[PDB]
Amino acid sequence: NTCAMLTTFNEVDMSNIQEMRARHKDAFLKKHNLKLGFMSAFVKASAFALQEQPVVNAVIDDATKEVVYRDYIDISVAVATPRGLVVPVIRNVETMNYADIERTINELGEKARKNELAIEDMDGGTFTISNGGVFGSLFGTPIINPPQSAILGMHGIFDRPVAVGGKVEVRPMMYVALTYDHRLIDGREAVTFLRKIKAAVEDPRVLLLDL
Amino acid sequence: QNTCAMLTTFNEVDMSNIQEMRARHKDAFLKKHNLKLGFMSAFVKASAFALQEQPVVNAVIDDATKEVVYRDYIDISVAVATPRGLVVPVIRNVETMNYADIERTINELGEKARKNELAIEDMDGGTFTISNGGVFGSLFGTPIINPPQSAILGMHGIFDRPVAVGGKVEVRPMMYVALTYDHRLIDGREAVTFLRKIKAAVEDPRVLLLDL
Amino acid sequence: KEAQNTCAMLTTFNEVDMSNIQEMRARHKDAFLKKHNLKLGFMSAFVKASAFALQEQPVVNAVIDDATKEVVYRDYIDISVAVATPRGLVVPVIRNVETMNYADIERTINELGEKARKNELAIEDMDGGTFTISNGGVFGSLFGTPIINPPQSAILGMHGIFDRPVAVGGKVEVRPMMYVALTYDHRLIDGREAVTFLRKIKAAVEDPRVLLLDL
Amino acid sequence: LKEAQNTCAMLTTFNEVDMSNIQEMRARHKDAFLKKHNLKLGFMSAFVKASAFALQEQPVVNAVIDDATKEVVYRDYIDISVAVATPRGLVVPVIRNVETMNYADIERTINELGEKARKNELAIEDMDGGTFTISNGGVFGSLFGTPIINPPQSAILGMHGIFDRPVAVGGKVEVRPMMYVALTYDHRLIDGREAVTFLRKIKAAVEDPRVLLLDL
Amino acid sequence: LKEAQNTCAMLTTFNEVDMSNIQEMRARHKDAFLKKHNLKLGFMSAFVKASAFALQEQPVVNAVIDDATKEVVYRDYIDISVAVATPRGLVVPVIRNVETMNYADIERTINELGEKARKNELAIEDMDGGTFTISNGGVFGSLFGTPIINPPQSAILGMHGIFDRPVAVGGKVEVRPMMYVALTYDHRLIDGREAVTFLRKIKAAVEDPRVLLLDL
Incomplete structure (x- = not known):
């Protein structure tokens, strides 16, 4: 309810x-x-x-x-553990390139694996990512953890035949998802958000070009 | 959910x-x-x-x-997207209608929506909701049932995908369609058949004339 | 609800x-x-x-x-398979599923179907299930989200087998594929468990030899 | 300049x-x-x-x-002084704080500065303070040549015309739009290794702009 | 420099x-x-x-x-100042009487000088006094450029990187490992024709070492 x-x-x-x-x-x-x-x-x-x-x-x-409205942006990435899946938080990401994101992810994953993460950085965040691609999944519905407003669900990467230029080609593809709430975001906005993530990943130069 | x-x-x-x-x-x-x-x-x-x-x-x-x-009249609330937002204009008596009339009424209701003469009378009483989120490129998604009706058909973007015909791979332009239905009155078989029949009617428009 | x-x-x-x-x-x-x-x-x-x-x-x-x-916890597995009758849909439960093979499952399914058709299927052969399989592919469905029948905790959604082009080994071929959906109670089952469960089901269906090989 | x-x-x-x-x-x-x-x-x-x-x-x-x-x-800020071509002649407008700009921001700054210069509005504050020069004589069809260090700066990047030239990729011969770039440096501060590495880094960044995001 | x-x-x-x-x-x-x-x-x-x-x-x-x-x-002896790589920085040891050794002895001299500069035991006895300096930039992949004469020499060689490049050999195009060579010379003593002839002789002796033995 x-x-x-x-x-x-x-x-x-x-x-x-x-x-x-x-x-x-x-x-x-x-x-x-x-x-x-x-x-x-x-x-x-x-x-x-x-x-x-x-x-x-x-x-x-x-x-x-x-x-x-929160001007800071933080993706709460997820890492799986034998005792249950835990969600760290990457903080202040709008000014980090790939190196900084990768290093923060590595540090947080190591801390989760060796169990030295407390609730001080587990709470908070404006976005979540549930990478369910480690265990091969085609696509699925990710749950919104509270108190966020949307979550990106990344799944496994598979080679399936796609049509580019009218010809069948085999490229590594991924199904992405976006669980939002209609009470705040309309369908058009969520579709545009997911399509923009798709554009910025499938051509990283868009980030440099601000497109 | x-x-x-x-x-x-x-x-x-x-x-x-x-x-x-x-x-x-x-x-x-x-x-x-x-x-x-x-x-x-x-x-x-x-x-x-x-x-x-x-x-x-x-x-x-x-x-x-x-x-x-079990209402006898068919009343479909086609959703037209505007920068102000998405509304639900309703097309009356779709059973006695054709492609030209449907397009004309859709355009007329959209024009009323642009200048905002959409009265309350032509905003409810629909029996089925058709929401087009395909004008924005989307593969597929789950729409929401509009009350008080118990179903909604949401179409998505049209992309070209390889599909097998007669055992041979051929590239054809395809769509993903969705239907969210209340299970408290219609079971899975009925709703799956409903979506299949919509798909069959769109794929080959002549079944409308043949009444299959 | x-x-x-x-x-x-x-x-x-x-x-x-x-x-x-x-x-x-x-x-x-x-x-x-x-x-x-x-x-x-x-x-x-x-x-x-x-x-x-x-x-x-x-x-x-x-x-x-x-x-x-x-x-x-239940040491015993009972799948509740939905069978189709002219008067509607019923969900008989096949009992003691661990200790039989493809032949006895067909026998039990046939007996339950012929009992439901002729209307002698009692309440003892109706309740007590532990997992349910919904064969929604008979009526040509691509994929969708099923619903768990209480008090069970998960449902596997079987869909229609469609001739679809898929690339394996770097080549594009046409194989008959089916989309499977798992709707699970998230209060008990986690994401890893659900994905691994669906993968095990898919692997066992793709190679029946896995069942006797006990992977 | 002598x-x-x-x-x-x-x-x-x-x-x-x-x-x-x-x-x-x-x-x-x-x-x-x-x-x-x-x-x-x-x-x-x-x-x-x-x-x-x-x-x-x-x-x-x-x-x-x-x-x-x-x-x-060792400055903690980079001041790129581009040579903007105008009908009157060549001027040297500057872009300030170039560490944090995307391609679009640099485009906007260059276009605005060119509009300012062409309509005769360029101020001194938009002309002084350079740290590196990107003088571009390539729209004139030059192949390659030696630029001159702009004072008080210690180096300059000279860009020239782009021509389709045969190159070797994997042992095969393919024609692709190839570009000659020059760097004129003060050898009292910059060794040969430092200047060559500077040009290699610039060439790698231009060839594959994804390096900037990847921070390699 | 200055x-x-x-x-x-x-x-x-x-x-x-x-x-x-x-x-x-x-x-x-x-x-x-x-x-x-x-x-x-x-x-x-x-x-x-x-x-x-x-x-x-x-x-x-x-x-x-x-x-x-x-x-x-006129020096009857040839001394070459080869720059040797070192994490501290490149230095200029000198080989003595280069005309009296073949490739094998030059290799051992270079290896010994590199080993000694790695341990920073480079004495000034075998560090200054050359007649013709040679600079290598091929380890940092420079394409071509003008080297600086190490004083008090009269000229210098400017070896650069080796890249596979499409070249014309007998009317047809094939990719061969090609390298730009540059000679910076004092025009007061060496004339234009002398500099071009010197670079051509170096080119000929490198393109086929059999000229060295043949004494062409």
């Missing part, structure tokens, strides 16, 4: 991020000592789209029926 | 035949009716046909008396 | 290649009729896959007790 | 940058860039941002010989 | 060198060279020996304009 949940889906062509991870895999590891991953691209695209559409960043206060 | 009854179903409709009709007859349509040809009329007519062939979907549960009302 | 509010149901989807199942049906239909006097189908494979996955994963089989707030 | 060509002891280094990705990105995003940002995508934003990247990773070049005290001051 | 730029009016002439012969000889002789000399073959020794040969044939470049007397001094 609190939240009514609805979901929209879309698909992202991960054929450019794979190339980046395939060419700058040793230089990045030599200069920073971390493994390149898909998660930084999606975090940065989420930050870009949240900046473009601040209504997705806002949240309704059910106690006073007030809409609070 | 708690206070929605939710429980949606999805299908794929091929739009090769509909775009062929548009490419063939859009000039004549503009010359005669002074309008433009889209895929909206196909979906509205298909929904009307599907509602004719099984009216239990068109029914509404009255929780006040535990009574199901 | 009170049941809707109390249960927070979430859905996840996957796809199954129905290439091995159809081949085994093609090669093992006449022998099935000669031996068991009964025709082969699709439901037995999915029922057995769900049974094997539940045996490996007891959490999905378990249900929370609403009366006392206890996650009561 | 009192710099010998006192600064300039040496010139040259490299080729492959403008395939830049042209690809322009062809792909020009329509949307004009529709949303109300400008036109260009070559110079990429080069200015690449220079900012290289001056971030290599701060000795960003420094200047302070002849008063023989000091090498 | 003095070299201000006093000498150094001019630079350029050329391109095939390295396919050197690459082939390395590919076929690396294993034997390592097994016998316990050293790994390099591209540098061929260039040093070719420069020594060209200095032998043209003794004008093997000479210095004496500043005090405005005269020329």
